[PDB]
């Protein structure tokens, strides 16, 4: 009987090198009938995936929903990271009020 929670370690902040693939993991306990979205928290924020669907650029963003041992890990992959991919990424659960976890990506050029 608990509401959805985001479990450690989720949305870890990272420094990556240009061209790496970068994963953001959102581990959700007690998701129930709620749903998960990934967002780039720029201004304006950009939707990356909602539920089990990648919103755009399937060659740039990948989603692996409900994986891990407990089938509760949501993994967003950013392919081939560039300087434009720097910034904050969020995992959102559609509770009310929303439940969020955010991590920051830095990208260094050789």
């Amino acid at each position: 009987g608990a509401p959805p929670t985001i479990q450690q370690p989720s949305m870890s902040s990272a420094v990556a090198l240009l061209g790496q693939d970068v994963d953001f993991t959102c581990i959700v306990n007690d998701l129930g009938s709620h749903m998960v979205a990934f967002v780039k928290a720029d201004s304006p924020p950009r939707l990356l995936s909602f539920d089990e669907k990648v919103f755009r650029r399937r060659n740039k963003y990948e989603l692996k929903p409900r994986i891990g041992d407990l089938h509760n890990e949501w993994v967003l992959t950013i392919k081939n990271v560039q300087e434009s991919d720097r910034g904050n990424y969020s995992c959102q659960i559609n509770t009310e009020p929303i439940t969020l976890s955010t991590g920051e990506l830095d990208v260094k050029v050789p």
């Binding site: 967002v39 669907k53 969020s90």
Partner: protein
């Protein structure tokens, strides 16, 4: 108030200027209708987001939020509508429609709900 409206509308990111209303005033307890125009003769998906908290409201053909007052529908060939079935003062603020088109269009709409 001016700062708030401008900070909302400055978030538009488009190659084609928004052809719809981008400032909507309604009275609390009435419905609100926010419009998103998409490119014609193509099957684009859109998503509506509430900027105050970042809540995703609708995505593609379906409501995402569990707040039951929100629905998305197709008003005509190229116009989608975010329908708020009963507006309250606390719904005032900035809303974004993102389109999955090649230019990754974002349209911004400022909603003001006035006291009944």
């Amino acid at each position: 108030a001016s700062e708030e409206v401008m900070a909302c509308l400055r978030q538009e990111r488009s190659r084609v200027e928004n052809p719809s209303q981008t400032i909507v005033n309604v009275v609390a307890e009435n419905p609100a209708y926010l419009h998103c125009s998409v490119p014609p003769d193509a099957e684009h998906e859109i998503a509506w987001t509430r900027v105050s908290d970042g809540a995703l409201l609708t995505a593609g053909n379906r409501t995402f939020t569990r707040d039951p007052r929100w629905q998305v529908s197709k008003k005509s060939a190229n116009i989608w509508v975010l329908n708020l079935r009963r507006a309250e003062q606390q719904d005032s603020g900035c809303y974004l429609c993102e389109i999955n088109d090649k230019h990754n269009t974002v349209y911004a709409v400022y909603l003001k709900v006035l006291e009944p």
